[PDB]
Amino acid sequence: AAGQSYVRNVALALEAQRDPSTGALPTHLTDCLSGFGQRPKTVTACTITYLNALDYVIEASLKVVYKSSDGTLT
Amino acid sequence: ANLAAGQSYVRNVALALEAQRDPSTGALPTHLTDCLSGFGQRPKTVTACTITYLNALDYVIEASLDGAALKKVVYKSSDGTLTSLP
Amino acid sequence: ANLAAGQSYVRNVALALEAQRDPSTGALPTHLTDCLSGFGQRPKTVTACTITYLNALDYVIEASLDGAALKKVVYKSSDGTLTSLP
C-alpha cells in the first residue's frame, strides 16, 4: 500500500493550503489524481470531499478513506 | 532563528500526536499534557509547552519562547492553524 | 531584493531544522515536509517550500520564488550549498 502513503501526502498538502488565520480550505480542489506530486500507478481514482470549510475526506481506489476530522485512515 | 525553531518544534509535536491517534477511532491519549519532553529534541528557546485536549480528538498546543521574535505559539488541531504572539 | 529575501528564509528554515536534531545521533524528525508555515515570517516571494529527507540526517529544502532574480532556490544540508548567482 503505496496508495496509503499517497493519501497521507495529499492530506499533508491540504493542511499546508489552509488559510493561516481561519483554517479554511479551498473547497473546489476535489480531484487528487493530479496536483499532489508523484501518484503511484496503483491509485486509479482519488477524490476529496469537503464536509465544511475545515473538514475533508479523501477517497482513493487502488478503497482507502482518510478523514481529516478524526485523522483516521481506512 | 528562535521563533522558527520554536514554531517548527510545535509542528513536530502535532505530527507526533497525529501518529499516536487510535487508528480506528482517532482518539488521542489525553493524559499526555506536557510537551517539554517526550517529543525528541526541544530547542532551548521553548521554555513552556502544554497540550490541552478539548475532547478525545482535538488538541491545542501552547508553547512559550525565550529570546525569540515572538513569545507564544498556539497550534490548534481542529482548524490546523498556528498563531504566534508577542 | 526578493531573491535575497527567499534565500534568507531558506537559511532560517535550515537553522530551525538543525535545532531539532537529536544531539547524540543527529537524527531529525522526518515528517515535517513543508516550510510554508512554522518557520517564522515567510516573505511573500516564497510561494512554495518543501523539505525532503534523504535519510535521518540529510535534507533538501526547495523553495519557489516569484518576482525574484531566480525562480527556485535549493538548500542541501549535506554539503551546505544554497543556490547562489555566480
Author numbering:
A (entry chain C): 41 to 102, 109 to 120
B (entry chain B), C (entry chain A): 38 to 123
Copy out sentences from the published article reporting this entry, exactly as the authors wrote them.
Type IV pili (T4P)1 are long, surface-exposed filaments which extend from the surfaces of bacterial cells. T4P are composed of both major and minor pilin components, although major pilins comprise the majority of the pilin subunits within each fibre. We identified a cluster of type IV pilin-like genes within the T. thermophilus HB8 genome, using the program PilFind.
Tt122238-123 adopts a typical pilin-like fold, with a central α-helix packed against a 4-stranded antiparallel β-sheet. Analysis of crystallographic packing by PISA highlighted the interaction between chains A and B as significantly larger than other interfaces, with a buried surface area of 600 Å2, 10 inter-chain hydrogen bonds, 4 salt bridges and a Complexation Significance Score (CSS) score of 0.4. However, such an inference should be treated with caution, given that we observed Tt122238-123 to be monomeric by size exclusion chromatography (SEC; not shown). Given the potential involvement of Tt122238-123 in natural competence, it is interesting that a closely related structure, as judged by r.m.s.d. after superposition, was ComP from N. meningitidis. The ComP fold is more extensive than Tt122238-123, with an additional β-strand (β5) and a loop which wraps around the back of the β-sheet (shown in red in Fig2e). Tt122238-123 therefore appears to lack a specific structural feature, the DD region, necessary for recognition of DNA. Furthermore, calculation of electrostatic surfaces for Tt122238-123 did not reveal a distribution of positive charge which would be characteristic of nucleic acid binding, as noted for ComP. The modeling indicated that the structure of Tt122238-123 could be incorporated into the pilus fibre model, although some repacking of the core helices would be required to satisfy steric constraints (not shown).
